[PDB]
Structures are given as structure tokens and as C-alpha cells.
From a paper:
PLLs are natural lactonases endowed with promiscuous phosphotriesterase activity. The catalytic center contained two metal cations coordinated by four histidines, an aspartic acid and a carboxylated lysine residue. A structural analysis of SsoPox, a hyperthermostable counterpart of the PLL family from Sulfolobus solfataricus, has revealed that loop 7 is shorter in SsoPox than in PTEs; linking the active site to the loop 8, which forms a hydrophobic channel that accommodates AHLs aliphatic chain. Indeed, W263 is located at the start of loop 8, involved in the dimer interface of the enzyme and positions the lactone cycle of the substrate onto the bi-metallic catalytic center.
Co-crystallization assays with C10-HTL were performed using the same protocol but adding 4 µL of a 60 mM C10-HTL solution (in Ethyl acetate:DMSO; 1:1) to 120 µL of the protein solution. Crystals were first transferred to a cryoprotectant solution composed of the reservoir solution and 20% (v/v) glycerol, a 1/30 (v/v) ratio of a 60 mM C10 HTL solution was added to the cryo-protectant solution for co-crystallization trials. The diffraction data for W263F and W263I-C10 HTL crystals were collected at the Proxima-1 beam line (SOLEIL, Gif-sur-Yvette, France) using a PILATUS-6M detector. However, whereas detergent-induced flexibility has no effect on the lactonase activity, we isolated variants of W263 that exhibit increased lactonase activities (W263T/V/I). These variants exhibit dramatic improvement of their oxo-lactonase catalytic efficiencies (148-fold for variant W263T), while the activity for the best AHL substrate is compromised (3-oxo-C10 AHL; for the wild-type enzyme). Conversely, the LacSV group dramatically increases oxo-lactonase activity and 3-oxo-C12 AHLase activities, while the phosphotriesterase activity is mildly modulated and 3-oxo-C10 AHLase is decreased. The residues selected in the LacSV group (T, V, I) are overall smaller than those selected in the PteSV group (F, L, M) with the exception of isoleucine (I). Noteworthy, subtle changes, such as W263L or W263I, yield to a large tradeoff in catalytic activities.
Numbering used by the authors:
A (entry chain C), B (entry chain A): 1 to 314
The structure:
Amino acid sequence: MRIPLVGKDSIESKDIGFTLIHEHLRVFSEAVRQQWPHLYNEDEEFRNAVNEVKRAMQFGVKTIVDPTVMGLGRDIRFMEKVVKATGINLVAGTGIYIYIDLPFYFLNRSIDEIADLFIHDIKEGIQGTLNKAGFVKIAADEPGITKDVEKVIRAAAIANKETKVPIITHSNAHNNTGLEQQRILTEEGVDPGKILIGHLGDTDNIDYIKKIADKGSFIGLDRYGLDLFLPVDKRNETTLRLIKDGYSDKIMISHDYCCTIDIGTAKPEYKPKLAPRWSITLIFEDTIPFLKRNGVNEEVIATIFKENPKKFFS
Amino acid sequence: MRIPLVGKDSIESKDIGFTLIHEHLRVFSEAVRQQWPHLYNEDEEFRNAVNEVKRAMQFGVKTIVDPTVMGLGRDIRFMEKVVKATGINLVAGTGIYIYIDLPFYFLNRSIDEIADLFIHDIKEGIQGTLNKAGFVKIAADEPGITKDVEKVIRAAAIANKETKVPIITHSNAHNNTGLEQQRILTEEGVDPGKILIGHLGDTDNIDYIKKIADKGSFIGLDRYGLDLFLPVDKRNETTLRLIKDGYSDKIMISHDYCCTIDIGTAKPEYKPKLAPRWSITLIFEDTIPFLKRNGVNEEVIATIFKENPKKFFS
Ligand SMILES: CCCCCCCCCC(=O)N[C@H]1CCSC1=O
Ligand SMILES: CCCCCCCCCC(=O)N[C@H]1CCSC1=O
Ligand SMILES: [Co+2]
Ligand SMILES: [Co+2]
Ligand SMILES: [Fe+2]
Ligand SMILES: [Fe+2]
């Protein structure tokens, strides 16, 4: 017992198997869904998540890590239902996803108070259930490291030191938010190897990507299919080059796929342009085959999808 | 019938009686309550709301207008419960309360889509019930009229023009947001007399306040008790001056009282410093008696608390 699973006994990290380290069963804006429920369709949402997960499993995915947290509409009971329907190993997290400011709740509250929220989810359980958080998720994006973003990062560090769960980040690959997240976490005493810096796959600036890896953290080549950020072929070229340059033991790969997401950008009519082949199994259809016919040994595949997740959670 | 009430048949505006135009039964951050329910206590929240409303009614309040909307934790079923327990006339609103950016939901969504949400609440009902919204609430504060804040303002104008419900605003009294809100709404073709520009009582700059009244809108002297914004006695002096200068036709008075609110600023420890006498009945204890001692007659009080709300909703 080591990594907590939704709706299951916890597992030892050696038993995680082939892992997708960053996918979403469902993403929504909490306040919008609360205020305007007519916009949403839970049956559709359930069907989509179950269908995607089932296809992932038939490609041999054993574990999915789902970093839906506050600000992305985390719902542990929804996650429970998808587990019961599929039998997936599902790792749920805690944390806060913001780009600018915290919710008004956090006015005149300390970093300690925020960390207490994360530690609650990890140690006690999530949203009144006994499903526990297996990692902390934090974000920064275009606005950079604002005061409140930094507060959340330091709170995540406190949670990691207390509970030893790893940290997954959302960053923007085109500013230095990823590097800064790494810096602040490590200065606060987080083991660099307990950090996945997210969304670095959004750039082909490999010098920047290697910088983070060199400082000891996993690098998230983690949005395969999201062409609007970076097209699949450039992602593949970047992935291949990083492998050839010796970085396979820092690489993590995923789709960031949202089986449903409520943002207007994800309207069906935009899909062909923005994310034509985006799904939870694209890497099996494209990336892994591509790697194998470009000289990449099976051992590297094992490293990225089994060994690295195992280390991360160890 | 043409003001909708929570849990009651709609009433004619002439029957609104003595009104508190801006009070909150309960405020919370949607995403925080959703993610960490352990932080909250609905029984306590209910008791607080019921007790405050009961005292208001003892002092002759017939109708309370509650501008709790998206971003402040509007919950129409909680509101229903308080109505059942008290018998108050309660006017619920629709709208969006943001200072900077919209929820991610609204990425690549039009102003029209926003207005449709408001119009849904007005014409169809709120959160899956048949309780309908009687006004739209919008906000701006220190960050000023941002792109997204502006979008919401324009959506409110669409809603008013379509349904004729009035608009209540939140503004920052020190940075012209209230005047800008008025300008944008009236430029869109909203009748100035269907706008309440909020939180103008937070300043004793009467030149600024008069500017807004002169352009035909109601002026919100509406945070009595919140000394951290402006002390009661200075509000009183400002209120009295405006009345002496003939402006009672535009004056609206309230507390902005929150029977519960979840922000750290409102920890009990802080109340004596920030808001010692803040409650839903302060104006009966202090303000109204003060005005009377200064020669303000019953008719003026009736204009402010009965006639003006009547006009607002007519
Ligand atoms: C029609 C399809 C277009 C793609 C949707 C727009 C891009 C959405 C990206 C997205 O899902 N971002 C969130 C969710 C998981 S991580 C994160 O920060
Ligand atoms: C210790 C008690 C002092 C309260 C300080 C916090 C002031 C909150 C005022 C307040 O209510 N502001 C928001 C929330 C409801 S409407 C609105 O615009
Ligand atoms: Co992300
Ligand atoms: Co306000
Ligand atoms: Fe994600
Ligand atoms: Fe308010």
C-alpha cells in the first residue's frame, strides 16, 4: 500500500504498470456548473469517460493519473463511477488550479491554511469520501508567478514534505513558469525527482526543456493531440531528439485528454482545426509506432510509461 | 405580478413595502465549497440567516433584495429554506460577479451566450427551479473595467433590454468603475433609472456621487457597518448631506450584510476591528435615528426605503 486509488485498495508503486500520467475524465468550471446546471449533461459525460478509458485499457494502459483539482471541477464520486464501470487504476489528486488570484475564500488566509486543505485530501480523503489524494497539482500560465500562484506552489511543497506525495504542474512552455515552479519547489525542500513540470511538450525549444530535466525533474511531453499548442509531428520530433540526447529517464508522455470539457474552445466545430486527432489513445496510434520505426528500443518505451511513473510515485 | 420572489407568487412593485436593497443571506466561493465541504456548516449558515432576517422583519422590513450571484455562491434552494422559515419577501438575481477574468467556461464564448444565461434565469428559473431572477448583478473593482468585466456589463444590458429587469452593480468607490458602469450600460441603451450603482457610500466624495445621480441612476449608500471601507459616522454625514442637497430621489441605503461569508477577512477575530456594528439592522439602530435627529422627516425615509425600490422595479 502506497499509491491511493479511487474506489480501490492502495497499491505499491512497483505495481502501477503502464501509466498515462496526465488525462482528465471531466473538466468544468465549478461556479458555472453550480449556477447553470442546464448547460451540462452527466450521462453524456459518463459515457464519454467510460468509452475513452475502456479503449485506453485495451491498448494496455493499467493506470491513469487524473490531475483534475479545484478550478477544474474535480468530482471524486464521478471518478468512482468510472472506476466501477471500467476497473481502471485511477489516481486522484488534490491542489488548486489558478492563473492569477485565489478564490475570495483565501483572503487573509495563510499558506499553512492552503496546505492543510491538501493534507486533508491526502490523509483524510476527498470531498467527504475515503478516496485519498496521491499527488498535488498546481498551475501557472501566461500571467506568470503571481503572488497567489506562488502561495499555492509553497503550499504544495508543504504538503509534499508532510506526506511525500509527488507534485504535478501545469505550466506555459513559452514563458519560464515551469522553470520557476521547479525553482520554488526545490528551494522549499521538494526533491526535484518528485516533480513533473507540465506542458513542456507545447514547445520545440529543447534547450529550455532540457534545462528543467537537468535540474532533476520529470518533463511533461503531455499534450499529444492538442495541435493548437504544438502539432503532433513537431512533438514527435522533439520527443525523439530528447530520447536520442539521453533524456528518456526524465520524459513523461500523455495527452491531457479531456473526455469532456466545458470551455467554448472545445466546441465540436473547432476540433478539426485545433485538435483533430486528440484522444486518450493517440500515442498508441501515432507516437509509439513513430518512435519504434525511428530506432527507439522497447526499453525506452518501458522507461517512459512504466519506470518513470514508478519512480515518480516512489 | 412582475417582481419574482423566492418561494412565493410574484408581487406588484407597489406592494414591495420597506425594502433592504442589498443584503446577502450567505456568500461563499463555489469551487472551495465544492472541493472542501469540511470547511462549511449549512446548519449554522441557516440559523444565522433566519435569525438576522427575523430581526429585520421585527423592525419593519418587508422585502430583501439579495444580489448573490455566480462568483458569490448563489443557492436558490438555501434561499427557499430561509423564506420558508421567515416569510420574508426575497428577490433573487442573476448575473456574474468577477473582478478580472471570467471562468474558463467562457473562453471563445460570445457576449450573447452570457446574456442567454441571465435571460434563462429571468424567464425560465434559477438552478433548475421555478424561482425566477428579478434583476441582474454585475461587478467591477480595483482592477477596473477589464475586457471580461466589460463583457458581463454588456450582457447585463442585453438582459435588461430584453426583460426589463433592473441592474444592481458592485463598484469600487475610489476608481470611477461605478461611473464607467453607468456610461457603458446607458450607451447600450439601458434606462439610467434601472441602474443601481453600488458601494458609492464607501466614499465621502459627494461630487463623484452626485455625478452618477445627476445622470439618472440610483446611488448605493449600501455598506453601512463596514467601517473598513468607511466608518458609520462618515457615511451618516455623507448621507445627510446628499439628502440636504435634494438627492433623496436617487439614494438607496443598505448594509451589504452577509449572514455568513467564508472569506478569511471575516474571521470572528477581525470583526471588532473591521466591522464592529455590522448587521442587517444597523440602519435602524444608528442611521435612521441620526437622520431624524437632524431634521430628516418620515417622508424622506419612506422615499428611500419604499418609493425608490418601487421605482427601481417598475
Ligand atoms: C475542440 C478541441 C479543442 C481543444 C480544447 C482547447 C484546449 C484545452 C486544453 C485543456 O484541456 N487545458 C486544461 C485541461 C487539462 S490541463 C489544462 O490546463
Ligand atoms: C470581520 C468582518 C468584516 C468583514 C470584512 C469583509 C467585507 C465583505 C464585504 C462584502 O460583502 N463584499 C462582497 C461579498 C458580498 S457582496 C460583496 O461585494
Ligand atoms: Co494543464
Ligand atoms: Co458588492
Ligand atoms: Fe491537464
Ligand atoms: Fe454585496
